[PDB]
Amino acid sequence: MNEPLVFMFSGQGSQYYHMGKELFKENTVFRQSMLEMDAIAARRIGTSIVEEIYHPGKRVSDPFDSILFSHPAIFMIEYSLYKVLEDRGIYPDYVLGSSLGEFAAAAVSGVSDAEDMLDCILEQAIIIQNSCDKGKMLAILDKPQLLNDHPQLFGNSELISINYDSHFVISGEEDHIRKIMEDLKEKQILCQLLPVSYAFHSSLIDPAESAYAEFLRSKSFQKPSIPIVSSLTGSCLHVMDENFFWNAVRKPMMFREAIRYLESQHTCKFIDLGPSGTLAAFVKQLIPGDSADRCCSIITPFHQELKNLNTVEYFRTPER
């Protein structure tokens, strides 16, 4: 059978400075799409998003956690990379959204156009920046069974995602998270802060739900034309409720269930279109080890986008 293409889109936590710079400099489709969306975003943020992403004084290791810039930046990078692949004749059989990536998945699917989805992202960043306290998300490089056997180790935090057997993310207030990190160090449990400044996917961003739901009622969305698999439900969506784009950042995620659903009906090929290749790394942990060739990423801090795009050419579906 022709193995279907899954386009995967990641969300908050996967961005980094200079993500996709080689595509921005050497690929006209990518650069044009980034500059087009930059004009829309500069009107609402007050300055170029692009110039912040590629600021020469900021390094990959400098956490790119400002919500006003990272929200638009993640969508712009992802949709621009979609445009590169579409222009080359590489089309998705499914799109998989994760966290803020649900927005890019929805735009690629046709639920809305890129300009309206970008606006919904800009609005959500501004509404959160005005009404919510700052917060943190922490990845635990260990077994999620720890949550059951030592629940007091993780007090004052909420579990938002289990990504594979040895990776899960929690979300909470800044001092609460920093105290958990102190406690985990004394237990020799390895962890890593995500480069974010809000406790996404937890109740600590609830102060923004009312204003965003108000905002979402002034919008009108189309039904998906490309099958969307959503990390919010772990399953494909065809009927979409009115608060979906809030739940995209508020509700916990079901990424493993999403991947299981796709591997249940066919042996898929997975392309990570989000920065860092976060979701391709998760998928590789969730499928048989010999099947790692079914999964690649494009935009990574190795800045090998052009070489990685040539790798993706082998995923092209046959004729006959």
Added chain:
Amino acid sequence: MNEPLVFMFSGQGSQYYHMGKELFKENTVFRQSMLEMDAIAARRIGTSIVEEIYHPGKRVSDPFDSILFSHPAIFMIEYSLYKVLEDRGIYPDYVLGSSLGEFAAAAVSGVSDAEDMLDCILEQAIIIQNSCDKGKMLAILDKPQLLNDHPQLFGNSELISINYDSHFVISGEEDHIRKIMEDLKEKQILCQLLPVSYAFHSSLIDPAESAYAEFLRSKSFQKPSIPIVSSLTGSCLHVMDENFFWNAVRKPMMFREAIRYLESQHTCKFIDLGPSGTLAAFVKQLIPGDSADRCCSIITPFHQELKNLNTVEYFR
């Protein structure tokens, strides 16, 4: 009034003589659709499918088991009724295919147009008739646990479908099925033969696979546009393999998993577009008893299709 509409399509075993005769007589859209497809199928079979469906010398209780007529008849009835609903502005959010009903669901959703689906069905009946031995299908009105506790009662048969807690169907050779029936009656276990002359959904129609697969490779089908939930897979369906329309008649079915998948996302309303209301009865058993008014059938041997069409219009 925001809970999604599911259009359901049954397959072999649900047909009966004089299906939807009141619609064929009184509904211009239904009649028009039936006669257009009858012309097409006549060029391939030789005679009229419709005149067989409404054979005046046949009663509802006479098994409509002639494959060359029953195959196209199920699709023609189901697609024609769909046209009646579309004409009334009642549109599906989902189509659900069961056995031969997957052809209708595929046609409604846009996988193929009605004429091409009808052609794939006719070729299937002809190939199966020309290559396969006859067989039988038996519904058992008792708990599927019987197959585990007393597997000796069902030897020489294949389980093809469990529909709810007190209904499953097996498939096998004519005499093998007749022996199972005799043994089930010594156990006071009630059963009922389906009106089919072939052991559908079992290995006994395998002699027809290579010819039908060869025929399929001369066809090109589109991506679904309307969401399809398939009893073949028990889940939503988006990318079909080459053998899908053969598996629609060859593989066991997972109707309960499909209904479970549909209720796991949202609370649906189910409209049975297949004859006899077979799928509607199954769903009533699979969802809470309070939710019986979420299931409607239309074409039943009571010949109340017009009254049922008024009922369903309160669904949208």
